[PDB]
Design a protein around this nucleic acid. Structure first.
Ligand SMILES: [K+]
Ligand SMILES: [Mn+2]
Ligand SMILES: [Mn+2]
Ligand SMILES: [Zn+2]
Lengths: 341, 117, 618
DNA sequence: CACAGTGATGCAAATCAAGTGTGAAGCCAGACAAAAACC
DNA sequence: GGTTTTTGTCTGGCTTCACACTTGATTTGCATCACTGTGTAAGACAGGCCAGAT
DNA sequence: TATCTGGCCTGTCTTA
């Protein structure tokens, strides 16, 4: 794993904590700009390409049939297999939480310029309340597709919310949500194994299972060292969800996850304590029925990273992470790195 | 003070007058007249020598309504009189030895709003 | 032994020198005055004094024979502190030094003034809302509240880089009303109404918001805050009571743009341009305000419960901030008005005939139209359709014009015309940057010689006030050869000076009725002058504020009665108090600077405290 | 080893307020006499 | 020394005033905290570069 | 031909 400094172009200011990257055929794109989209780029979506350690963010345009989604910080993002991306929840530039869900798909790719389609998916049934810091993944069981959504945060409900603590947040109820994109319905499952609320965890999806790693529980204020397996069964009848705790779980909140090879992923970054960043890195090996978490060699972090209080980033996709730490202030607000694997 | 010869003269004359006339209150403006006529060479020498002894003496000389405790002690004052610094000592001891002071404090609680307004 | 001076001697000694005149005085008193030696000497002395123009001693001796004690009530000391700008730390020096020389405690010590403050600050008087306010607490002892309003700050969240303190909107209003009680009573009286009358009052409130730059950051531990502030203030503008089928102007603010009545409500160290933190902090304030639109505040004034309804007018916003909080594009855009859907090119061709169409309500619709794109349109077409409204508003402002910034922007334009009239651009179209630099230097030197104006970097209220005169046009004509264009400038400035009083005065109807009457006529000729004798600058373009000034001034004036009093200039003047109070009236530390300034800025706006300073002028 | 603040806090020191009768200080009266500065 | 002005003393009783202790509650005095601003543009010096002088 | 000084430029260093 080799760490590399990155330079940025004139619109470096867009990149903020809570931003997202999406991968379409090796070309990376960027979403969640700081502030509302400006006339320089009305969609808020950018072609995000790093060439020789210099990152240029270039505007991308939408299709005629597209929604113009607001920039969203900390949404639940997911990849769907014909390739498309799911965005659920998140905060808007106005600090509102969106209950909507958007679908990002490549509409056209003429002369290496990409037009996107942003379509809003309506959702009925037990729709999850508006949230951020939560996971969403797609499972496959018996030739069927189903979306799973767990954890996160929201503001108090309208009955108890008061202006004096207007911004107070609380963990969502830890109900697993099955969400069928084909029909637009959502089903909520309460499980005994999932007692506490959890946000800023990592989610790994293989076949009919999703593993839940780390996270932070607001009420307890603990970063539990637990791992949860969630298996979903898709028979001809109503699906069933079974959860199992599996010891040997990492303790990390806000970690970033990338896929190095099929069935192996790396987990880097995030926090072990409010004041203690997680400098170690973990390797996950998946078995059809087993999950393996292994300590790996820590990277050659620079002294900036080591002493920074905060860092943030997302996965670029080709087993390479894009990292950010708060920089000097008069210069540019953030210092960016790329860590490859 | 230090006393002149004439002043010793006047003091001795006042002593004489008091011993001769016990039930008698002297007038000041007439007594200074008669003493001044008596003073106006041998009689005076006794007083003259007395004055220097007094000079030696000079040399030697150089070397809002009230607290509930207030409502309680005002009433208990008559019984102690029957029995100031001493009265207050007794009042404080008995008040300290005493639900006992709840009524005096309720009266003070009524009076506190009246002071405020 | 030369006679000493009579004042040096001992009592016994002065007795012997005056025993001759003493007996002579006891006669006069028994013969002429009933043997009152006291009262005959008291009067002889007092009269001796005023004989020597020494009235002060005599007047003091009088007060000490009357024996009345001299001492200021704490609230009156507070007013002298708050209004003369003394710090507690300085006022304590004054107090202490007076009490040590006089021997009397004229001024009160600080703990009492600090208690006197309690009445004048939010959270002291009790009130209630019928119906109860939605999403607001009903506690009434809420004073200074943390401005982040429980904003999540754990290291996983979005990074919190501001410090902010505020008052709860209602709790604040209540405190303002109770500050105004005496002025509300006496305002009924002079209207021949019943003091105790309690009907449905109506409080019109001016809302103002601005950013500051160049707010230095303190050393010390804390958030690494930005070097900018934001202020939300309100001014109580008028209160009318409904008595019959008539609305009676019980109160109207005499000085609507004074720092003295712009009341502080929210101070934050943050950048207005940082939308994420701006909405985070102000959204709780807008919620409280939304709630008060649908309730009536019952509150106890002078014994008798009164009811107040509230109308909120957000007008102390510069165009930059308006556009920011109402989802509109930035001022560069083709969509140049925040009051209409006109385009920059359109405003250049028509100039005058446009009506007010945008509104906080309309904008909210159009964002949703933007976001959803219901006619599956292209982005050009989509933007055309929503007329530039491509972000979600979050603050309701009146569609108006701010006079201060209007006055500024206009003068700044004239300053440019002056330059381009010096270079004869009306005749020679192209000119090097170097050639234009000297046009500005020429005009700059001359404004100094003829008008005593030094050059300034960015345009000024007073500079504008002084540049936009006809005397200045005289100055500028000395630099332009063609008197055909002296005539054009002179007219353009005449029209402007006919127009300006309409949108700057408090009551144009009363104060320049003929200027108000002719506005549609004068603004047409101005527009036509720009379109003919000033083609070189105004063909195909016009400035945001020329448009606002030429197209929307009369409509606004009939909707509202004034423009000049809803202007931001009162709040901008408040910024000046911010800088001073942060230096010289606050604990000098990152976790106290905001609240100390918030509180002490509120006192400085208290009419009750201000009244004590007009007591000389009974 | 710069230095005079910047306001709120909170703990220590002062003040208050009542009961009544002690002594101490200053004072008055006429007359004369110490001291202490000036020819 | 003679002379002139400051300070007394002698006495009985007149007034005014501080003091005398205690108790609980107010009201003042005072030190404490971590941080403020006033210190603020241009000249000296070296080293590379290349066209016109030696 | 084969050097060669002087301006010219940039860039750091010292105090404000
Ligand atoms: K002013
Ligand atoms: Mn502004
Ligand atoms: Mn401003
Ligand atoms: Zn317009």
């Amino acid at each position: 794993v080799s760490l590399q400094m990155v330079t940025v172009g004139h619109n470096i200011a867009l990149i903020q904590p809570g931003f997202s990257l999406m991968n379409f055929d090796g070309q990376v794109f960027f979403f969640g700009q700081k502030g509302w989209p400006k006339r320089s780029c009305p969609t808020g979506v950018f072609h995000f390409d790093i060439k020789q350690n210099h990152l240029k963010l270039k505007p991308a345009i939408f299709s005629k049939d597209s929604c113009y989604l607001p920039p969203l910080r900390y949404p639940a993002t997911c990849s769907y297999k014909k390739h498309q991306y799911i965005i659920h929840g998140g905060k808007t530039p106005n600090n509102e939480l969106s209950d909507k869900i958007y679908i990002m798909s490549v509409a056209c790719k003429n002369n290496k310029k990409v037009t996107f389609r942003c379509t809003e998916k309506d959702l009925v049934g037990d729709v999850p309340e508006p949230r951020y810091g939560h996971s969403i993944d797609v499972v496959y069981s018996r030739g069927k597709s189903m979306g799973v959504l767990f954890g996160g945060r929201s503001y108090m409900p309208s009955t108890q919310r008061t202006t004096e603590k207007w911004n107070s947040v609380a963990d969502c109820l830890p109900h697993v949500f099955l969400i069928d994109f084909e029909f637009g319905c959502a089903t909520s499952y309460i499980l005994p194994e999932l007692q506490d609320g959890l946000s800023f965890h990592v989610s790994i999806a293989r076949n009919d299972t999703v593993y839940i790693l780390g996270g932070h529980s607001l009420a307890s204020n603990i970063r539990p060292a637990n791992l949860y397996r969630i298996r979903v069964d898709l028979p001809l009848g109503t699906p069933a969800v079974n959860c199992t705790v599996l010891p040997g779980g990492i303790s990390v909140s806000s970690a970033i996850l990338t896929q190095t090879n099929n069935d192996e992923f790396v987990i880097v970054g995030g926090y072990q304590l409010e004041n203690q960043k997680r400098m170690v890195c973990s390797l996950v090996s998946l078995g059809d029925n087993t999950i393996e978490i292994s300590e790996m060699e820590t990277p050659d972090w620079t002294s900036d990273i080591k002493h920074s209080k905060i860092w943030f980033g997302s996965n670029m996709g080709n087993g390479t992470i894009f990292l950010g730490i708060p920089g000097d202030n008069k210069s540019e607000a953030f210092y960016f790195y790329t860590l490859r694997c | 003070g230090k006393m002149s010869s004439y002043a010793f003269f006047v003091q001795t004359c006042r002593e004489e007058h008091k011993k001769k006339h016990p039930d008698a209150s002297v007038n000041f403006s007439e007594f200074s007249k008669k003493c001044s006529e008596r003073w106006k060479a041998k009689e005076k020498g006794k007083f003259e020598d007395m004055a220097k002894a007094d000079k030696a003496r000079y040399e030697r000389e150089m070397k809002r309504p009230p607290s509930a405790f207030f409502l309680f002690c005002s009433e208990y004052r008559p019984k102690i009189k029957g029995e100031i610094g001493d009265v207050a000592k007794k009042l404080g001891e008995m008040w300290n030895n005493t639900d006992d002071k709840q009524p005096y404090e309720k009266k003070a609680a009524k009076l506190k709003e009246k002071y405020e307004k | 032994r030369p006679r000493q001076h009579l004042l040096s001697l001992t009592r016994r000694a002065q007795k012997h020198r005056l025993r001759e005149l003493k007996i002579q005085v006891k006669e006069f008193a028994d013969k002429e005055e009933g043997g009152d030696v006291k009262a005959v000497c008291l009067t002889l002395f007092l009269l001796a004094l005023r004989a020597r123009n020494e009235h002060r001693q005599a007047d003091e001796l009088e007060a000490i024979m009357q024996g009345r004690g001299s001492g200021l009530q704490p609230a009156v000391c507070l007013a002298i502190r708050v209004n003369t700008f003394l710090s507690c730390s300085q006022y304590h020096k004054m107090y202490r030094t007076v009490k040590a020389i006089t021997g009397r405690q004229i001024f009160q010590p600080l703990h009492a003034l600090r208690n006197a403050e309690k009445v004048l600050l939010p959270g002291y008087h009790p009130f209630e809302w019928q119906p109860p306010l939605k999403n607001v607490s009903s506690r009434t002892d809420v004073g200074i509240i943390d401005g982040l309003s429980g904003l999540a700050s754990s290291v996983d969240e979005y990074p919190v880089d501001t410090i902010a303190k505020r008052f709860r909107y209602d709790s604040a209003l209540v405190s303002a009303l109770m500050d105004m009680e005496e002025d509300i009573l006496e305002g009924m009286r002079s209207q021949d109404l019943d003091d105790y009358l309690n009907g449905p009052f109506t409080v019109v409130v001016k809302e103002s918001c601005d950013g500051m730059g160049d707010v230095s950051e303190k050393h010390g531990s804390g958030p690494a805050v930005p070097e900018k502030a934001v202020r939300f203030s309100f001014t109580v503008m008028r209160i009318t009571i409904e008595h019959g089928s008539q609305n009676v102007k019980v109160f109207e603010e005499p000085k609507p743009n004074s720092e003295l009545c712009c009341k502080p409500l929210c101070l934050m160290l943050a950048d207005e341009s940082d939308h994420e933190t701006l909405t985070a902090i102000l959204s709780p304030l807008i919620a409280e305000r939304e709630a008060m639109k649908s309730s009536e505040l019952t509150l106890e004034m002078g014994g008798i419960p009164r009811t107040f309804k509230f109308i909120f007018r957000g007008t102390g916003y510069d165009e930059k901030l308006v556009r920011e909080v109402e989802g509109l594009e930035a001022s560069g855009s083709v969509y140049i008005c925040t009051l209409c859907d006109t385009t920059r090119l359109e405003a250049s061709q028509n100039l005058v005939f446009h009506s007010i169409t945008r509104s906080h309500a309309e904008n909210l619709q159009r964002y949703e139209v933007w976001r959803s794109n219901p006619y599956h349109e292209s982005v050009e077409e989509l933007r055309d359709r929503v007329k530039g409204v491509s972000a979600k508003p979050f603050i309701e402002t009146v569609p108006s014009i701010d006079a201060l910034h209007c006055d500024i922007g206009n003068a700044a334009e004239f300053y440019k015309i002056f330059q381009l009239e010096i270079g004869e651009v009306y005749k020679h179209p192209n000119a090097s940057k170097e050639e234009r630099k000297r046009w500005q230097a020429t005009l700059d030197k001359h404004l100094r010689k003829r008008m005593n104006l030094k050059p300034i970097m960015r345009m000024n209220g007073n500079f504008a006030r002084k540049l936009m005169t006809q005397e200045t046009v005289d100055a500028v004509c000395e630099l332009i050869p063609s008197e055909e264009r002296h005539e054009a400038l002179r007219e353009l400035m005449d029209l402007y000076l006919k127009m300006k009083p309409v949108w700057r005065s408090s009551c144009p109807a009363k104060e320049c009725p003929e200027s108000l009457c002719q506005y549609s006529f004068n603004s047409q000729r101005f527009a036509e002058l720009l379109s003919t004798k000033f083609k070189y600058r105004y063909e195909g373009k016009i400035t945001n504020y020329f448009h606002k000034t030429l197209a929307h001034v009369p409509e606004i004036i009939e909707r509202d009665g004034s423009i000049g009093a809803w202007a931001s200039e009162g709040n901008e003047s408040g910024n000046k108090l911010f800088r001073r109070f942060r230096k010289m009236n606050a604990r000098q530390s990152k976790c106290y600077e905001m609240e100390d300034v918030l509180k002490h800025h509120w006192l400085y706006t208290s009419k009750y405290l201000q009244k004590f300073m007009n007591a000389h002028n009974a």
